[PDB]
């Protein structure tokens, strides 16, 4: 279950399809309020291909429901993103992940 709560409105007609790149200037957080990732401290936007299983399952089912220029807030459940062993050193096991994704250009 991915809960997509919007933050700023977008275009509402351009949505990502298969085999298409996206650029996403996200910043990820935990449930407690501690930030574990940001793509704006590096000033380099994250770019990924949809459908080829680069990102986690919660990220792409989260990025597919948005529009161009829309900025939303996801709450990825721990079942869909790093369930048992997690990522060692960053995210504790069985932790809820929150993402403030923003799609800049190209669907």
């Amino acid at each position: 279950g991915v809960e997509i709560e919007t933050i700023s409105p977008g275009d509402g007609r351009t949505f990502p399809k298969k085999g298409q790149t996206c650029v996403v200037h996200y910043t990820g957080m935990l449930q407690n309020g501690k930030k574990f990732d940001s793509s704006r401290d590096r000033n380099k936007p994250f770019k990924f291909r949809i459908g080829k299983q680069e990102v986690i399952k919660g990220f792409e089912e989260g990025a597919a429901q948005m529009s161009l220029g829309q900025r939303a807030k996801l709450t990825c459940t721990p079942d869909v993103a790093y369930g048992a062993t997690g990522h060692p050193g960053v995210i504790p096991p069985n932790a809820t992940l929150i993402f403030d994704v923003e799609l800049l250009n190209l669907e």
């Binding site: 449930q31 407690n32 309020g33 930030k35 809820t96």
Partner: protein, 872 residues
Amino acid sequence: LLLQTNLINYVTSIRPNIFVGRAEGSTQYGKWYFEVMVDEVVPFLTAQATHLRVGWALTEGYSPYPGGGEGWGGNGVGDDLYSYGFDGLHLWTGHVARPVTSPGQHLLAPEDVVSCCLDLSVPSISFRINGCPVQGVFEAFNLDGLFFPVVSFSAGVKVRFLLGGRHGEFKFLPPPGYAPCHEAVLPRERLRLEPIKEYRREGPRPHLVGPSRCLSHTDFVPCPIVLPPHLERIREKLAENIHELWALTRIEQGWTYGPVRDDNKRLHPCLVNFHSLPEPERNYNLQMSGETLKTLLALGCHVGMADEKAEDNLKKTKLPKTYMMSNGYKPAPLDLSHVRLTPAQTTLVDRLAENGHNVWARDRVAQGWSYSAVQDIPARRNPRLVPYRLLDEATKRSNRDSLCQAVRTLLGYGYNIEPDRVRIFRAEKSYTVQSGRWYFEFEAVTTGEMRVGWARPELRPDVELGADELAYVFNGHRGQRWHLGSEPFGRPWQSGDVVGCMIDLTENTIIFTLNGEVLMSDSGSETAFREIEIGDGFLPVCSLGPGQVGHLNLGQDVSSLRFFAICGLQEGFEPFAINMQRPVTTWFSKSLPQFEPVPPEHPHYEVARMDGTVDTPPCLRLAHRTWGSQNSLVEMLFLRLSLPVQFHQHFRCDDPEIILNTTTYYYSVRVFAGQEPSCVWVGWVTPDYHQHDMNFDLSKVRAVTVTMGDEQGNVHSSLKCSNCYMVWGGDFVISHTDLVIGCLVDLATGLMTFTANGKESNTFFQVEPNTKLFPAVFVLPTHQNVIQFELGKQKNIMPLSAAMFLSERKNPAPQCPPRLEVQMLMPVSWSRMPNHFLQVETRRAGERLGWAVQCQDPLTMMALHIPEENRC
């Protein structure tokens, strides 16, 4: 467990001079309305988002400091229980975000109008965005204080204010019963845009200010015998005198005698005489004369009756041909030109005029009137319904010249009448000097209580600056030096003078120079303090009183020093920062009390961590060292433990099986003999608690009740946010037995029940899913033995050491590690001024656009997070 770092933005806060309060006697309306229209917001100027919320706050609590605070950082509106923020889709109060269900939910985009409704008669604070109301309001809040509009913006935000019709243009019409916010401005003040709790103000030559004296809660309220026969006959003679004085000025400006009464036609019905006045005019004068002598001996001034022959020898004043009116009849008032008023009577004529309007303000408030800037007779609003110290000088002089008439004629008849805290601005401890000769200066913009000099780096902010042996300081208001007492020295200050301070560590002498002139004492000595030890060193210190303003030029530039070459250069003294590439950082004192551990060598309180026997669990005690005579300090101290407990993020919704699967924890305290249980408050404290008052009670506890429903009007949820979740010990019970107050928490359901002596009570509390709670006991010591934190385990519930530590979650034995100590809330603490503040542009642009405000400078800083106290 370890310290975290992140880059956080800077935020400000600006208010107008619109304070709204309610009391027993409330002279304001109580329900107001204002609008805020945004026009330009950058979404992401830096890596963190631009923080922008809108709402109200109170006076004494909302102190947004630029460096440090609660949470990770960037504290503004909504980050405490004192302020109420709204960003478009979150209702911020108490540093927890509540998401709303509003049509078209988004952030505060440009070209948006956000409105804030307020009512104090019943607590309710509503918000409507772009003419559509939101489904979330704040109720059951505390009203001990005054409310004012606050916005808090990060870098890259321009926003306009819409306070009233005279200052702006309301794009939406207010609801019926909500007055515009421009009417509650006081007559002694014009509407300004100012920051809150400031310490740095930029000037032509940066000026350091003191704490502002804001308005009190009971300052807006107005505050209020037999009569002997020797003064009962003079009440008619004074009443005809005032009617003769009223008819004299009325004929002088243009009123005439007539049967009908008209102001525009200038008709006066009582212009002939006092007996020619009608009966409701006559008895009104005598009750008003009966009131003003009723308050005359009510202040305590003694009157006597003498020299009756000299009063009868006094005639009426001379009236010329131009003095008599068009009817042919003139009043003949008593001449008071032989009698001159003394300043003792000048102080009493202000006190009688103060008592006359405050009894007029209370009776109009009892009728049902209120105050506004406009004068609306059918709306029950009149602009002079403020107390006498908040009334303008035009109305204050008008009633004093009207009451100076009645005093000097009664004096002409022979009757004789008988008569927050303090800020400390010091430099950093890495710039302390040990040798050589150093000089700095201090300009005084506003005269008053300011103390400048040199102090050692081990200076405590709790003591008054100059009453201890840690500073050699010179006070300039009454002209005396302060070091282990007081002694007169030099001259008093004026407004606009520079005070030069030189130290010389080679001869151990300090010289104070006021405006280039070397100040001498009464004995003739030019040096002020002699034979001072070096020790740990000296650093320049500066104190400013309440409301005072003055910059401390430490002497970084040589040409910026005004009186350096006149005195203090050829003697050998050098400026402080003569070769420094960056400006000197200053460490200033806070008035926000923060928790910190008890010192081991404290003369009044001490603790002792006692070990656990087979009968008594491992426990710790506080005992008063000096309870009897010899400088005993008995004031209410607030004690808190060092580690919090953390509730589980999702709620649930003896035998070894029941102890390993339970999530409920217990701790108790035992109140000793001789300690009265009325002064004992036991429970839990959530970390944003910064109230240190010696008159603490559970009614003086911040509580905010948020109710958010659907668009139909029915509610969906009700959450109460408080910082102090405790109970009173006097409700449970020379007591010879000991009172045991226990606390029960369930981390799965979030339910807290309080037990006393093995009996459960009627109270219950529910918390947020993500919160932390500190076990605290607030107590006033009325014995040598006060309290005792006992971390014991009951029959089937684990002690508190399992919830606070992860290694001992499954060990049920009670332990007391040295990381568990007790804290105490000292009222002051040391923090550091930042070197670059946010530059704000305040300017009114047009009468319909409103007051515009903007900042564009990007600023970031790094800070520690410290997760066990959630304080940056």
